[PDB]
Design a protein around this motif. Structure first.
Motif, PDB file in Angstrom:
ATOM      1  N   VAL A   1      45.729  47.605  45.978  1.00  0.00           N
ATOM      2  CA  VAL A   1      46.941  48.321  45.573  1.00  0.00           C
ATOM      3  C   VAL A   1      47.719  47.511  44.532  1.00  0.00           C
ATOM      4  CG1 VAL A   1      48.865  49.724  46.432  1.00  0.00           C
ATOM      5  CG2 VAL A   1      46.968  49.184  47.950  1.00  0.00           C
ATOM      6  N   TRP A   2      46.970  46.847  43.654  1.00  0.00           N
ATOM      7  CA  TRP A   2      47.511  46.101  42.531  1.00  0.00           C
ATOM      8  C   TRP A   2      48.481  45.037  42.972  1.00  0.00           C
ATOM      9  CZ3 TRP A   2      45.294  47.267  37.895  1.00  0.00           C
ATOM     10  CH2 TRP A   2      44.673  48.475  37.790  1.00  0.00           C
ATOM     11  N   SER A   3      48.235  44.447  44.138  1.00  0.00           N
ATOM     12  CA  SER A   3      49.096  43.386  44.675  1.00  0.00           C
ATOM     13  C   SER A   3      48.494  41.980  44.632  1.00  0.00           C
ATOM     14  CB  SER A   3      49.461  43.686  46.124  1.00  0.00           C
ATOM     15  OG  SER A   3      48.373  43.378  46.963  1.00  0.00           O
TER      16      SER A   3
ATOM     17  N   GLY B   1      44.800  42.217  41.216  1.00  0.00           N
ATOM     18  CA  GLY B   1      45.417  43.391  40.635  1.00  0.00           C
ATOM     19  C   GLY B   1      46.706  43.112  39.894  1.00  0.00           C
ATOM     20  N   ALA B   2      47.484  42.142  40.377  1.00  0.00           N
ATOM     21  CA  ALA B   2      48.794  41.863  39.753  1.00  0.00           C
ATOM     22  C   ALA B   2      48.640  41.059  38.472  1.00  0.00           C
ATOM     23  CB  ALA B   2      49.726  41.160  40.714  1.00  0.00           C
ATOM     24  N   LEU B   3      47.631  40.200  38.466  1.00  0.00           N
ATOM     25  CA  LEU B   3      47.303  39.399  37.295  1.00  0.00           C
ATOM     26  C   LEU B   3      46.616  40.220  36.228  1.00  0.00           C
ATOM     27  CD1 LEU B   3      45.956  36.210  39.153  1.00  0.00           C
ATOM     28  CD2 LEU B   3      48.208  36.521  38.075  1.00  0.00           C
ATOM     29  N   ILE B   4      45.926  41.291  36.613  1.00  0.00           N
ATOM     30  CA  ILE B   4      45.265  42.150  35.628  1.00  0.00           C
ATOM     31  C   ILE B   4      46.349  42.847  34.810  1.00  0.00           C
ATOM     32  CG2 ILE B   4      43.941  44.277  35.357  1.00  0.00           C
ATOM     33  CD1 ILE B   4      42.270  43.316  37.831  1.00  0.00           C
ATOM     34  N   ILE B   5      47.337  43.415  35.491  1.00  0.00           N
ATOM     35  CA  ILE B   5      48.459  44.071  34.811  1.00  0.00           C
ATOM     36  C   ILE B   5      49.145  43.070  33.885  1.00  0.00           C
ATOM     37  CG2 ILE B   5      50.734  45.148  35.103  1.00  0.00           C
ATOM     38  CD1 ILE B   5      49.576  46.132  37.866  1.00  0.00           C
ATOM     39  N   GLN B   6      49.445  41.898  34.419  1.00  0.00           N
ATOM     40  CA  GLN B   6      50.025  40.798  33.657  1.00  0.00           C
ATOM     41  C   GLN B   6      49.211  40.506  32.416  1.00  0.00           C
ATOM     42  OE1 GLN B   6      52.257  37.125  35.226  1.00  0.00           O
ATOM     43  NE2 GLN B   6      50.085  36.584  35.403  1.00  0.00           N
TER      44      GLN B   6
ATOM     45  N   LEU C   1      55.326  52.327  32.869  1.00  0.00           N
ATOM     46  CA  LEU C   1      54.265  51.920  33.748  1.00  0.00           C
ATOM     47  C   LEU C   1      54.082  53.038  34.770  1.00  0.00           C
ATOM     48  CD1 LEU C   1      52.383  49.455  34.471  1.00  0.00           C
ATOM     49  CD2 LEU C   1      54.139  48.944  36.184  1.00  0.00           C
ATOM     50  N   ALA C   2      52.992  53.777  34.651  1.00  0.00           N
ATOM     51  CA  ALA C   2      52.760  54.939  35.466  1.00  0.00           C
ATOM     52  C   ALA C   2      51.539  54.700  36.331  1.00  0.00           C
ATOM     53  CB  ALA C   2      52.529  56.124  34.567  1.00  0.00           C
TER      54      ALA C   2
ATOM     55  N   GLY D   1      51.216  50.808  43.067  1.00  0.00           N
ATOM     56  CA  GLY D   1      51.174  49.591  42.270  1.00  0.00           C
ATOM     57  C   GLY D   1      52.316  49.488  41.252  1.00  0.00           C
ATOM     58  N   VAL D   2      52.832  50.630  40.836  1.00  0.00           N
ATOM     59  CA  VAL D   2      53.988  50.658  39.920  1.00  0.00           C
ATOM     60  C   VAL D   2      55.180  50.022  40.593  1.00  0.00           C
ATOM     61  CG1 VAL D   2      55.683  52.209  38.827  1.00  0.00           C
ATOM     62  CG2 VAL D   2      53.215  52.525  38.544  1.00  0.00           C
ATOM     63  N   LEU D   3      55.495  50.493  41.796  1.00  0.00           N
ATOM     64  CA  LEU D   3      56.570  49.906  42.613  1.00  0.00           C
ATOM     65  C   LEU D   3      56.426  48.398  42.775  1.00  0.00           C
ATOM     66  CD1 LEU D   3      56.582  52.657  45.367  1.00  0.00           C
ATOM     67  CD2 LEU D   3      58.140  52.472  43.455  1.00  0.00           C
ATOM     68  N   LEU D   4      55.202  47.925  42.938  1.00  0.00           N
ATOM     69  CA  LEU D   4      55.002  46.516  43.191  1.00  0.00           C
ATOM     70  C   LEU D   4      55.091  45.699  41.929  1.00  0.00           C
ATOM     71  CD1 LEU D   4      52.030  46.531  45.752  1.00  0.00           C
ATOM     72  CD2 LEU D   4      54.457  46.545  46.268  1.00  0.00           C
ATOM     73  N   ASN D   5      54.837  46.320  40.780  1.00  0.00           N
ATOM     74  CA  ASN D   5      54.716  45.578  39.533  1.00  0.00           C
ATOM     75  C   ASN D   5      55.770  45.828  38.460  1.00  0.00           C
ATOM     76  OD1 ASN D   5      52.127  43.809  39.412  1.00  0.00           O
ATOM     77  ND2 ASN D   5      51.652  45.587  40.698  1.00  0.00           N
TER      78      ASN D   5
END
Ligand SMILES: CCCC/C=C\CCCCCCCC(=O)O
Length: 339
Positions: free
Chosen positions: A102-104, A113-118, A137-138, A146-150
């Motif tokens: 979940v992109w966390s 997941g969080a580093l990929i967005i980064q 960020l959608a 994942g939007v909420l988290l990132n």
């Protein structure tokens, strides 16, 4: 032509679950200062057994080895004016979900997941994001969560690097779930069946999952899991975020152990309640799951307003109604519901 084209991250330390490189698809828009970054969904896995089984049957969600080199934007990623009336000319980014977390995830199976967005953001600076004015960020489903988290992480990162002229915003679609009691209780075995609360307790420890620091600080240590549920993360968010959520989400129901009546009501009712103090929302009364990248996202309506018009009205009021929870307690009481 209109295709989004695949790029892999130049930092090879940031990977999908099986070590393959992560990446993003991009269609540049000559002219537009508007960027749409979409997070794909597709469940998750929280232990070895479930991830091994995901790896064999849903391998695309854990590796980039078979990703096609281009894909066509659809719904809000579409460049066709008929399909995407207000946003068709934006810079379009699709970020495939290959981290089952979940992109966390932030630990360098790998969960990143969080580093990929980064990393995607950092790459896009050098591709015109440096010269941008709006960054939305959608994401749908796990990507909606994942939007909420990132979203605030992404905002912070863009200040740090010297780009305060970009306004970061969020659009969370089918990502707003309740940490509720099951209809018919069952053990945490299968992904599809395990309860919402226990799933993420498992998940967060397994993924070394990270949550937004403003939500994190305001919970006891080892209690970080609470911040996966929209109602607990949201009031803490600095970024403006629009919420799209079917009142009767099929994923919600699967983890509440329903397989196709007083229980339904309670869920539908509490959804109305969780959303009554979120001013930016669109919750049609239908039985469905996800919408923002489906070509027929233009067909749905609440109180006379389409989803694309509601987001535009939301966007206008940030620089025409915006809070739109469909008003009944039953799936298929709204004539424009899909299929
Ligand atoms: C619905 C499970 C409880 C929600 C908790 C954390 C966010 C996970 C959201 C995953 C949605 C699953 C469906 C999908 O991703 O297509």
């Amino acid at each position: 032509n209109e295709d989004l084209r695949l790029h892999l991250l130049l930092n090879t330390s940031v990977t999908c679950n099986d070590g393959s490189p992560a990446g993003y698809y991009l269609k540049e828009s000559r002219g537009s200062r508007r960027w749409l970054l979409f997070l794909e969904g597709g469940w998750y896995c929280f232990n070895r057994e479930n991830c091994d089984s995901r790896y064999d049957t849903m391998r695309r969600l854990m590796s980039s080895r078979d990703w096609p080199r281009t894909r066509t934007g659809t719904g809000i990623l579409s460049s066709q004016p008929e399909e995407n009336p207000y946003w068709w000319n934006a810079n379009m980014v699709f970020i495939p979900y290959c981290s089952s977390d979940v992109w966390s995830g932030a630990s360098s199976y790998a969960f990143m997941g969080a580093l990929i967005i980064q990393e995607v953001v950092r790459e896009l600076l050098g591709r015109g994001l440096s010269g941008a004015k709006v960054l939305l960020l959608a994401g749908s489903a796990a990507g909606g969560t994942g939007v909420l988290l990132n979203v605030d992480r992404v905002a912070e990162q863009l200040e740090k690097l010297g780009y305060p002229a970009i306004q970061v915003r969020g659009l969370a679609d089918s990502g707003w779930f309740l940490d509720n009691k099951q209809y018919r209780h069952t053990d945490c075995v299968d992904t599809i069946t395990c309860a919402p609360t226990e799933a993420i307790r498992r998940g967060i420890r397994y993924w070394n999952g990270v949550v937004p620091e403003r939500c994190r600080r305001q919970f006891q240590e080892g209690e970080e899991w609470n911040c996966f549920f929209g109602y607990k993360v949201y009031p803490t968010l600095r970024s403006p975020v629009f919420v799209v959520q079917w009142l009767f989400d099929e994923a919600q129901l699967t983890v509440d152990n329903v397989h196709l009546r007083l229980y339904i009501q309670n869920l539908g009712r509490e959804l109305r309640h969780t959303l009554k103090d979120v001013p930016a929302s669109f919750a049609p009364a239908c039985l469905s799951h996800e919408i923002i990248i489906r070509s027929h996202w233009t067909d749905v309506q609440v109180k006379g307003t389409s989803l694309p018009r509601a987001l535009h009205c939301w966007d206008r009021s940030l620089h025409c109604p915006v809070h739109l929870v469909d008003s009944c307690p039953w799936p298929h009481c709204n004539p424009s519901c899909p299929t």
